[PDB]
């Protein structure tokens, strides 16, 4: 397929040093992964990285979304237009750790996934959520059961997480 320059893992998990917004700008996946919060409110990130990319759009449509149904909860989902970056995006809400939010709430995240055969996606609770990138991973692999095309935007965590991997 279109998925170029991504070390293999394990049977359906793939990794690359790559920023999402590009690789979905030149791939136009299926499916986008949104490290959202329970607002949908799209600021810093990756959910702000996404939503600037889409001109707005994305904030547009998610405001809509929350002012009809409400929060999402933490480890939950929601299916929304991908905009310009691919068909849809699913917004999954891993836990904050800076929040005090459950870690065990990342295996729900993930399995969130499992729900759509091909995903972009970035490593859930990673970065500005405060978790371990290398326990991501871990549960990513041990979860997933589809096929994921993981991007790491810093090139030093990206080496770091392949060269650990058990």
């Given at each position: 397929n279109s998925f170029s320059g991504y070390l293999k893992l394990t049977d359906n998990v793939y990794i690359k040093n790559a920023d999402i917004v590009e690789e979905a700008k030149k791939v136009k996946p299926t499916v986008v992964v949104n490290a959202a919060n329970v607002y949908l409110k799209h600021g810093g990130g990756v959910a702000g990285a996404l939503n600037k990319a889409t001109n707005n759009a994305m904030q547009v449509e998610s405001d809509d979304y929350i002012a009809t149904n409400g929060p999402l909860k933490v480890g939950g989902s929601c299916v929304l237009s991908g905009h310009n970056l691919a068909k849809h995006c699913l917004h999954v809400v891993g836990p904050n750790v800076n929040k005090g939010?459950?870690?065990?709430?990342?295996?729900?995240?993930?399995?969130?996934?499992?729900?759509?055969?091909?995903?972009?996606?970035?490593?859930?609770?990673?970065?500005?959520?405060?978790?371990?990138?290398?326990?991501?991973?871990?549960?990513?692999?041990?979860?997933?059961?589809?096929?994921?095309?993981?991007?790491?935007?810093?090139?030093?965590?990206?080496?770091?997480?392949?060269?650990?991997?058990?």
């Open positions: 939010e459950d870690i065990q709430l990342l295996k729900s995240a993930y399995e969130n996934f499992n729900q759509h055969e091909v995903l972009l996606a970035p490593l859930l609770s990673a970065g500005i959520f405060g978790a371990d990138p290398i326990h991501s991973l871990r549960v990513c692999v041990d979860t997933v059961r589809t096929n994921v095309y993981l991007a790491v935007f810093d090139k030093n965590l990206y080496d770091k997480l392949v060269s650990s991997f058990l």
